[PDB]
Design an enzyme around this catalytic site. Structure first.
Site, mmCIF file in Angstrom:
data_model
loop_
_atom_site.group_PDB
_atom_site.id
_atom_site.type_symbol
_atom_site.label_atom_id
_atom_site.label_comp_id
_atom_site.label_asym_id
_atom_site.label_seq_id
_atom_site.Cartn_x
_atom_site.Cartn_y
_atom_site.Cartn_z
ATOM 1 C CG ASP A 271 -1.852 1.178 1.271
ATOM 2 O OD1 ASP A 271 -1.917 1.933 0.289
ATOM 3 O OD2 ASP A 271 -2.541 1.333 2.300
ATOM 4 C CB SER B 157 -1.699 14.455 -13.548
ATOM 5 O OG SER B 157 -1.997 14.205 -14.914
HETATM 6 N N1 LIG Z 1 -4.284 3.419 0.361
HETATM 7 C C1 LIG Z 1 -4.226 4.102 1.638
HETATM 8 C C2 LIG Z 1 -5.044 5.394 1.621
HETATM 9 C C3 LIG Z 1 -6.425 5.359 1.732
HETATM 10 C C4 LIG Z 1 -7.150 6.544 1.718
HETATM 11 C C5 LIG Z 1 -6.482 7.750 1.591
HETATM 12 C C6 LIG Z 1 -7.227 9.075 1.584
HETATM 13 F F1 LIG Z 1 -8.581 8.871 1.586
HETATM 14 F F2 LIG Z 1 -6.844 9.758 2.704
HETATM 15 F F3 LIG Z 1 -6.853 9.781 0.478
HETATM 16 C C7 LIG Z 1 -5.104 7.784 1.486
HETATM 17 C C8 LIG Z 1 -4.386 6.605 1.495
HETATM 18 N N1 LIG Z 2 -6.305 1.581 1.098
HETATM 19 C C1 LIG Z 2 -5.990 0.706 2.214
HETATM 20 C C2 LIG Z 2 -7.033 -0.402 2.223
HETATM 21 C C3 LIG Z 2 -6.804 -1.540 1.472
HETATM 22 C C4 LIG Z 2 -7.741 -2.556 1.456
HETATM 23 C C5 LIG Z 2 -8.904 -2.426 2.188
HETATM 24 C C6 LIG Z 2 -9.933 -3.549 2.153
HETATM 25 F F1 LIG Z 2 -10.033 -4.008 0.869
HETATM 26 F F2 LIG Z 2 -9.553 -4.576 2.970
HETATM 27 F F3 LIG Z 2 -11.128 -3.039 2.566
HETATM 28 C C7 LIG Z 2 -9.146 -1.283 2.937
HETATM 29 C C8 LIG Z 2 -8.204 -0.266 2.953
#
Ligand SMILES: NCc1ccc(C(F)(F)F)cc1
Ligand SMILES: NCc1ccc(C(F)(F)F)cc1
Length: 330
Positions: A35, A199
């Site tokens: 992630d 972008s």
């Molecule tokens: N994949 C992690 C993640 C999930 C949500 C956000 C948000 F909503 F804060 F932009 C940032 C990072």
């Molecule tokens: N962006 C982080 C994240 C990744 C996967 C999930 C899920 F799929 F498990 F819900 C939630 C939040």
């Protein structure tokens, strides 16, 4: 040193990608969601509330001769989709595709939200944003990438996500056989802790390219592409019968339509997302309404270049002292 691991979609829609990770001595292999939008390495464990585990592989620190409890440390995280989890912290040996880090903070989940319990294929998350976002208290902990940086041949990792197919995360080197043409690098802002960049514009299908600055983050942990309401309306206006649905929570479109491609700008270069990448299938089994992979960021507060966009490119995360992001066609 370097490392290389295959990442595999968890379902037929590419909703997420899992990558095997070895934790402990002897190795306990768990499949983690890499992630770039977060900075915690957390896992389902023998400490997770029993009713909140439904088929996941669990980490058992008591069976690891190198695990050490980090006395007094706790963690608690909330993701932008509303998911959350929390628990305590071990340090242990963690290896990704041959690349080993000793003394990595492994956050053991005692509680997880329902959306994690229902996802039997994901054993935890491996955060790859900047360490300023790590939630460990009272002593903040470093990510796997930050801990490995010194030992890497080059302080980079690359994401090569597949469309309905396996892909590759590489640490420490750039596979020049995995992309075509040149890599275009663009500046990153770390001020919010994300791989945040700008972008240079977009195009819909074969339309004219619109030069306009779109600030957003490169997030392997987010499935879809979330962009400003003006851009998203311009895209879905080109799809007959598409509309925003409040009950569904986004743009839907007739499953019989063909979707146009979406182009986004990286400096002077263009990355093209094929229209098939934007189809996320019926909103329920048997429905003839399909869910779109490009959605508005209005309710979120930040634009997100998730897997829909990233899997169309070879992406370099350059963690040099001045960090940059590189994009190449593939
Ligand atoms: N994949 C992690 C993640 C999930 C949500 C956000 C948000 F909503 F804060 F932009 C940032 C990072
Ligand atoms: N962006 C982080 C994240 C990744 C996967 C999930 C899920 F799929 F498990 F819900 C939630 C939040």
């Amino acid at each position: 040193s370097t490392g290389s691991a295959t990442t595999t979609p968890i379902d037929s829609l590419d909703d997420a990608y899992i990558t095997p990770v070895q934790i402990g001595t002897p190795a306990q292999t768990l499949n983690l969601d890499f992630d770039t939008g977060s900075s915690d390495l957390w896992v389902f464990s023998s400490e997770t509330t029993a009713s909140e585990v439904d088929g996941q592989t669990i980490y058992t620190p008591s069976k690891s001769t190198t695990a050490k409890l980090l006395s007094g440390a706790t963690w608690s995280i909330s993701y932008g989709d509303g998911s959350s989890s929390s628990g305590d912290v071990y340090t242990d040996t963690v290896s990704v595709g041959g690349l080993t880090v000793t003394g990595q903070a492994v956050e053991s989940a005692k509680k997880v939200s329902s959306s994690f319990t229902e996802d039997s294929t994901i054993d935890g998350l491996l955060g790859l944003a900047f360490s300023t976002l790590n939630t460990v208290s009272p002593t903040q902990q470093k990510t796997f990438f930050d801990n490995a940086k010194a030992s890497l041949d080059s302080p980079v990792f690359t994401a090569d996500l597949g469309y309905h197919a396996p892909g590759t995360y590489n640490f420490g080197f750039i596979d020049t056989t995995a992309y075509t043409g040149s890599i275009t690098y663009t500046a990153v802002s770390t001020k919010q802790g994300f791989w945040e960049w700008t972008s240079t514009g977009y195009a819909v299908g074969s339309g004219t390219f619109k030069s306009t600055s779109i600030d957003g983050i490169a997030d392997t942990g987010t499935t879809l592409l979330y962009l400003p309401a003006t851009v998203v309306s311009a895209y879905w206006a080109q799809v007959s019968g598409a509309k925003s649905s409040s009950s569904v929570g986004g743009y839907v479109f007739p499953c019989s339509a063909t979707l146009p491609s979406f182009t986004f700008g990286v400096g002077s270069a263009r990355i093209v997302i094929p229209g098939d990448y934007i189809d996320f299938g019926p909103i329920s089994t048997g429905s003839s309404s399909c869910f779109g992979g490009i959605q508005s960021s209005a309710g979120i507060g930040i634009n997100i270049f998730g897997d829909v966009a990233l899997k169309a490119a070879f992406v370099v995360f350059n963690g040099a002292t001045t960090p940059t992001l590189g994009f190449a066609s593939k």
